[PDB]
Design a binder for this molecule. Sequence first.
Ligand code: 46I
Ligand code: ADP
Ligand code: MN
Ligand code: MN
Length: 274
Amino acid sequence: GSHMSWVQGSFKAAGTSGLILKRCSEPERYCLARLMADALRGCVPAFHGVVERDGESYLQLQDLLDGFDGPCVLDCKMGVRTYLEEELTKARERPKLRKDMYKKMLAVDPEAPTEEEHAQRAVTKPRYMQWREGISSSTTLGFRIEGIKKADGSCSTDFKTTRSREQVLRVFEEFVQGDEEVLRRYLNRLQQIRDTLEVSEFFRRHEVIGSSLLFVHDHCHRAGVWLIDFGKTTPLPDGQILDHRRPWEEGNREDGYLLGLDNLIGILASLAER
Ligand SMILES: O=P(O)(O)OC[C@H]1O[C@@H](OP(=O)(O)O)[C@H](O)[C@@H](OP(=O)(O)O)[C@@H]1OP(=O)(O)O
Ligand SMILES: Nc1ncnc2c1ncn2[C@@H]1O[C@H](COP(=O)(O)OP(=O)(O)O)[C@@H](O)[C@H]1O
Ligand SMILES: [Mn+2]
Ligand SMILES: [Mn+2]
């Protein structure tokens, strides 16, 4: 019925029922305006424009939870790559050694850092993001589960080493809790999303990094999926286009978004036959 209802750091309650405010960023704002006129219009939350809240700009979005009765939510980070190629450029010309990310890496695996990273107590952003891709399913399957918010109020972000196809299947199995109608509805929606992406003018002309698919369902068997988070989705130069399936290699700007979606549909289709 509301995301802000579950909250109780980039979101704020809107004044209008059914909406939510997201801290406005230029890349995301650009993206949402273009998407409202794209094939993908229905695959993303409604973008109603910008509002100032305490001398501060917010995107006015559809709250995707508004139609659900006690929503279960799963955030699935899409792509084989989760950072812009410019992060590699910045990390070589002028590294901003991130002590925070060394610490976050240390927590998951104190042995992961190199001799020199240990000595710096700091890693580069790209190295941290590449490590996170490789110990999750991101690198091999082209997506990863980031978190779940349940109908019993229980939330979990404990998926950093969820990597095998079967490990990911078991998360979706637990998430859908035997609801065949929810799983069929998710699969019908993902098939239609994949069809829409494959014809989208926006999708062919944009490097889609850092975006998620948000799975939402309730005990009344309502089920929806939307693309969210266009903060790192960037227009390709001139008339360049991506296939969104081929492997990333610095300079080709490939995201493996549709490799992710192909695998995701594959795993849900497997689960539906179990
Ligand atoms: O937050 P989501 O989209 O799930 O994931 C993207 C974000 O992942 C975070 O890592 P963990 O998920 O392991 O905590 C990074 O610290 C954060 O980066 P910074 O630390 O802010 O530089 C990055 O974000 P970005 O800045 O939007 O690229
Ligand atoms: N339009 C929306 N309606 C409802 N919940 C949303 C919406 N957008 C995001 N969320 C929730 O907020 C979380 C983070 O959203 P996201 O766009 O990735 O923010 P960020 O840019 O801070 O990473 C999602 O995983 C989901 O739980
Ligand atoms: Mn995000
Ligand atoms: Mn973001």
